Amino acid sequence: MRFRFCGDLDCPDWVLAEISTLAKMSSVKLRLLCSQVLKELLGQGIDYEKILKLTADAKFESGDVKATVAVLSFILSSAAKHSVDGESLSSELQQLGLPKEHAASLCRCYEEKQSPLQKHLRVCSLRMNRLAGVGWRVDYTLSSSLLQSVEEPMVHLRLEVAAAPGTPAQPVAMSLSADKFQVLLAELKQAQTLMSSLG
């Protein structure tokens, strides 16, 4: 019929094919392999030597291990996409042919780390730019060739933007009069007031 962990859509074909490959392993070794891939998603790091050693017993070659890791990441992320719980995912996996033992073993670790995973996914979602930092300087002009006496201030601003993780930041520089600075500050405050009522 259909399943929910894939967003209320028919389960893809590659996951169906490769979950059987996942099923030809030991549950305890799964409790460590899924932990490794989940930590990789969480940003701690992945030790491919560890997973190769863990699955070295079954002599799984490049294709099988590749598919297994892909399926683990895909299915875990898809289940966390809709905030699905362990009890429903275990039944759905049972409908997929995975033995109840493996479903229990995997959900033992999946159910106990969903919050950090989901918060990281929220933080690491699609975005175009981000303001890393800001710096400013104030100037007070005294005299000039154009005008003998001025006695008015000026504001210098710098904005640092990170366009992607592990990327150099391209700074932005500009010089502003007092009026533009004040209007910009007022408009920013208006935007914040409009934008703080959504929570």
Partner: protein, 105 residues
């Protein structure tokens, strides 16, 4: 009764039709879909759609069985079937025929 369905679906699970491992559906959908995919993966001269959905009504199913009976002999089937016989779920008449298609696929 399932002593033979287990074997035939296990063969079709490992024959490239891993959808046969699903649970909750009648054997008809699994076996007929496996046969449908096998007839085309081998890819003889086919010029007619075999599209269907699980638990289809007869209004399309009987006609689709008519087309598969029309196309199957044209693809050099080693064994002959009868249009009324396919709805009968004659797994004895399906065990030897799928040997050719499974290995060909």
């Amino acid at each position: 009764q399932n002593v033979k369905l287990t074997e035939i679906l296990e063969l079709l699970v490992a024959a490239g039709y891993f959808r046969a491992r699903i649970k909750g559906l009648s054997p008809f959908d699994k076996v007929v879909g496996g046969m449908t995919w096998c007839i085309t993966t081998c890819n003889f001269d086919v010029d007619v759609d075999l599209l269907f959905q699980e638990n289809s009504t007869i209004g399309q199913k009987i006609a689709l069985s008519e087309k598969i009976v029309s196309v199957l002999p044209r693809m050099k089937c080693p064994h002959q079937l009868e249009p009324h016989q396919i709805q009968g779920m004659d797994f004895i008449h399906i065990f030897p025929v799928v040997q050719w298609l499974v290995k060909r696929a």
